[model samples]
Target chain A: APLRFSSDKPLLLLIDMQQAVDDPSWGPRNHPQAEQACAGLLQAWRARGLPLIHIRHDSVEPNSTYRPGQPGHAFKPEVEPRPGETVIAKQTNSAFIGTGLEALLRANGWLELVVAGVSTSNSVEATVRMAGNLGFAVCLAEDGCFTFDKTDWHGRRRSADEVHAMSLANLDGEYCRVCGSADILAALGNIAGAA
Target chain B: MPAPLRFSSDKPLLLLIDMQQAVDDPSWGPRNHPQAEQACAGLLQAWRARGLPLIHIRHDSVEPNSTYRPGQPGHAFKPEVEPRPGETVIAKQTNSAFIGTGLEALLRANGWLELVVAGVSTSNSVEATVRMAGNLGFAVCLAEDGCFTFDKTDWHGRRRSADEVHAMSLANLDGEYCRVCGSADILAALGNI
Candidate 1:
């Protein structure tokens, strides 16, 4: 059986679900309904009054969409955090690097994290790997994350589905438990029923 | 015109991840690059020749049957890139070497600002470490030719060739986390003949 979420010691980690990530300029992206899936998880966590962490990417590149002061830097309306929720701004792909995310998790004694968000092959993947490396039990919401299509070094184009699936394959069972949002919702229901 | 090959920084360190006998077992299936070990060995020799810093990361799995477990012959490092006297060896249980190990602190102390990463299982240790290194603000150069991966089956039971796996892993890291290049490009950047 897959690992179950503990109602008492879990965190909802939303990685880089920002306006820039939704830009069509990023090329074709996987999971047509991924934003809706992430919104569903966010809503569930909020209704349960669970701990939540929002990671926003702040690119140092002046022309990048994620750069500060750019319209793309704002959070997507569907998954934006409410007041008092922890929002961490990071310059790199991994949310744990410059952000105090690790310290905050350690301080709050959060050992288990449920992760989801945009660019499944980029920030989402990087953050999940770090969470696992730091000894946190990670449950990646597979359908809740998405990625953009990319051109390989050989100039061959790879679809977003290919990129997303490959990233999941590299992470599943090794770094995190790759589960669907529905599975997590079911687990949350189980926790509530037991309580 | 293509960008000229150059080291991002003067103080660059080489990281060799989990090149043990167990990984070389036939069970891994057809590997992507046949000359991966030779490529890795060449980088190690060049680094040693230049008296540059090197770190060898070994995985010590807790699983009793794992080839990486302590007291197993498979846990030993491959002869081609074995650690010499005065070199640092870090032991890790997880895929990323930065965890539990003081690798980050060691690099900070040494003031090594850049890294050249290579090893077995490109999709595993190599990708994990490269992402971490990039996240930690270190400039990373991934030696594509020096890394290899085994065949993998997706969750749907679809088989992926080792070559396909290696290619995808490199694509994921290139430009986003690291500069993917061949071992010869890395050697040239390091001023190695």
Candidate 2:
């Protein structure tokens, strides 16, 4: 069965697709195709005239890549917001905090969110959990989000793929419905067909 | 050099999430850190002895056959970390403890800002709750050795061992959400030993 999007109340949320995310300092990354997937969803949402929100993480750390006035603070070219699209600047991993994103969604009556972005185990995971906990129906674009590799607390190594998969598994069936980008695009097509 | 790892806090709370019997089911597959229960018990005992605040989160599944169902013995907390009177026990149906329960309010009212979190299924409840706590401006310290997870299958049908799952979870959260440290480090910081 395919997930369906309510034509009127759906919102596309793009989280922290920034230049800093491309820095190799974070470690090896997975899902090289994630940028294209996110672009496809953004293009479709704009084509359908549905609401879209872009979240950028502006780190407070002075030497951080995501810090303001830094090169990495800029959005990645593919998912960068065009003029008139809602853009939110957040200092934390969860976009809703200090961003008024939750209030904006409530004011616009958009209860369903289609979320995709970079760093699957960081801002993406945090934002998805918050959206679900806030009572919004969420369809997470699994392939449309990616994460970097990391060394565990016990000096063990984990690949980027392992981190991404575990993050999705933790959220699937519990916080949000984890679906691929194709599933979400097809669902959007279904909505258009019905409309 | 990196900043020194500090586990001690003036206002710390121990959050033990989903330390129930259901996690012992064979369906979850092999788990690592065989001494996870004892580690959790050690923290619980230390918190009790220090008269620190403690909150226990229990998972109550809605599915009938689920081990965490209300009437099942699996729903009960493990003997090593059972809740004593005056300690809070939050029953939740979801992975994040802050979702349905008044956990946020309870913590706010009590002014417990710093958290030391541990429990079963590190990748599930522990990760979810830690993210929320960090987002809410609470300082969180995650006990890596005090929590554990079961093996998981990826979208490609490849299975990963519990060790991989636990390690990845801690790595994902280490600097972003909380400081990941061993139970011994936490206990030592609290002056338990």
Candidate 3:
């Protein structure tokens, strides 16, 4: 029989969904529909008293979007940090690089990490690979993460939407298990009581 | 027949690596190596000729020995023309970002699915990464004329030129069937050939 971790065995990692990283123009925006779906899924876990960890990316440069003093560095208004949500700040793109994120998860006895949040192509990608390398099970929220446009060496710019959708297609199984919000909710519901 | 365009029937991508602020230290001398420029020239021509996409990545931090400094001028590319506006510039921390940065997805979406990479420091981080990327199914060609790294020993504390390391990568990477080409050869190959 395949062994599966109970609800208590997984931790929900809310990664860098700060205002600085997200685009405000017509191009990139948070997936509202997905967020609603995830919000509901999170409620199921919260009700069950599951562990939740919030992570933010802080830049050393004071003027960077991820700057500690900047408004852009703040978390999005829609996704409010609940009372007792454990938040960890990191300097590099990889959550495990300088931060003790890996240790924290291991110490908490969590193996399966349910990852969701901003910049589908950056923070999301970093977390999945590092988590995989560290021997933890990872799951991505298909509709929950977002990203922005970037220029290539030749100077061709690509929209965040293009990058975000492509990441989902590639990361679905290579780095982690990718599930829609509804499927994740169902899975959580079935396992919630057990934990 | 296996198939035509086996490696890349379409065009290939040009990867710019570690041109961050700290990596290009002056200790290596100012605008010291001509190979970097020569490699850039070859890749630029190929990209223009074949309509290949150009990709650049800045390592997002300044580690103790790493060359990518945050605001250092040495970290910038010393080319004639700067990166075009529509190109993709990703900031990455580690190698094998096909999963780490969703770079593969970006490539597939743009239809430039193959990769031809050349950048700083062979044998250490860059070399190790190319090995990983190859195993992941992306077709890669390491530009022999592009990469460079300083010399060091396992235990004996002797230092060597970056060229020595560069040459070794060209040799070892050949075993992996990496098309180790100088800038001129790569440019010629890409031209209506």
Candidate 4:
């Protein structure tokens, strides 16, 4: 299917963009320039006055770096939420859970979403699934997110890129239309083409 | 540090996704886990022995030429884990069972919050349903050996095998959406085996 949607402005959703993900504690992460990609998208969307929402993860776990008041929970300097933009703090992986995100969207009657953020497999995947299930048309930016490596069930160490690519695979067709940040920008630039 | 994947529920709903005969069709291409159904049967048998609740998800494709169409014989459940007289079955047109189906209502009505899933094709319907169940506030656990998927080619036209696909799905969901474990671990947690 082609990456097509109505001309209605798509909400630029940035998920869990906090300094915690950049901390040295995490394993080797893919997409070293993920923040830069997100910054580029933010710059484009902001210049056009498109709707924007930034979701920050406020972890409840005592030792979790994303917990409140810790330096880890702070927003990444590159993609920090601007003063006018809506900032949602979520305790769970999906931003929709126990938060006013849905209510906020409903209030504004925003339907389409362009979501991009850290760790494609975890919070990004979780929120995208929920966003799709909630009947919102979503466009997940492939290059706009990153993730760390992990050891699988068979004890084989999978690289960050492998994990990232696979997560994108699972979501591409079923949940959302996945394309690169450049594609999204190009589509937005050609507003007539998006429709 | 991450904790071990140990979960116990007073009532765990065994939700099987797309266990229909269509999966065995040659068109789906090569799939991993030849023993996948065996594992599903083992878990189904254990759930039955314990008199737990189960829901069989039948993917009734609305597409004109989908193998999972309701009118097709391929839509029938595989003999291995066919539903018995009393088991519940829900037919869905989409990937996620909770969508359009009364699955969530049924779960809420019966207080069946904890879920144990076994199914075919880990990447599509299985992953979709599990993510919904988890986000909807259900305690979801996946039987790894009981679920497998066919090979998937990436957007680059590079073909990936079922093993690669299945492993990646597990990694995405293991700690985020649900607990991933073998049938033996689930039985052990259930106890009284």
Per-residue lDDT for B65 in model 1? 89
Tens digits of lDDT, candidate 1, B32-140: 8888999999999988988888899999989988888889999999998889988989999888888889898989988987899999889998888888888787888
Which ten residues in a row are the worst by lDDT in model 3 chain B? Answer: B152-161
- What is candidate 2's lDDT per residue for B55-153, written digit by digit as tens? 999998889888888789999999989888878889988778888898989999998888999998888888888988888888898987889898888
Would you list the rank order by lDDT, best first?
1, 2, 4, 3
Which model scores highest in DockQ?
1
**Number of residue pairs clashing in candidate 3, backbone atoms closer than 3 angstroms, sequence gap of 3 or more or interchain:** 22
Q: Which stretch of 10 consecutive residues in model 4 chain A shows the poorest summed lDDT?
A: A1-10
**Model 2 per-residue lDDT tens digits across residues A1-195:** 778886555788999899998887887899999999999999988988888999888878888989989789999999989999889999888998888998989988999999999778888888998888788899999889998887766687778887787778778877789998898877876775677
Candidate 2: pairs in clash = none
**TM-score between model 3 and native:** 0.50
lDDT of 3 by residue, A132-193 (tens): 64567887776777665543222445455544554564455546777666666667656746
TM-score of candidate 2 on Cα atoms, chains taken together? 0.91
Error at B66, model 2, angstroms: 3.8
Tens digit of per-residue lDDT, candidate 4, span A76-174 = 999988787889888778888889998888889788899999878888988887788778889999789988998766666888887777777778867
List residue ranges in candidate 1 displaced over 4 A.
B8-11
Report the error of model 3 at residue A94, Å.
1.2
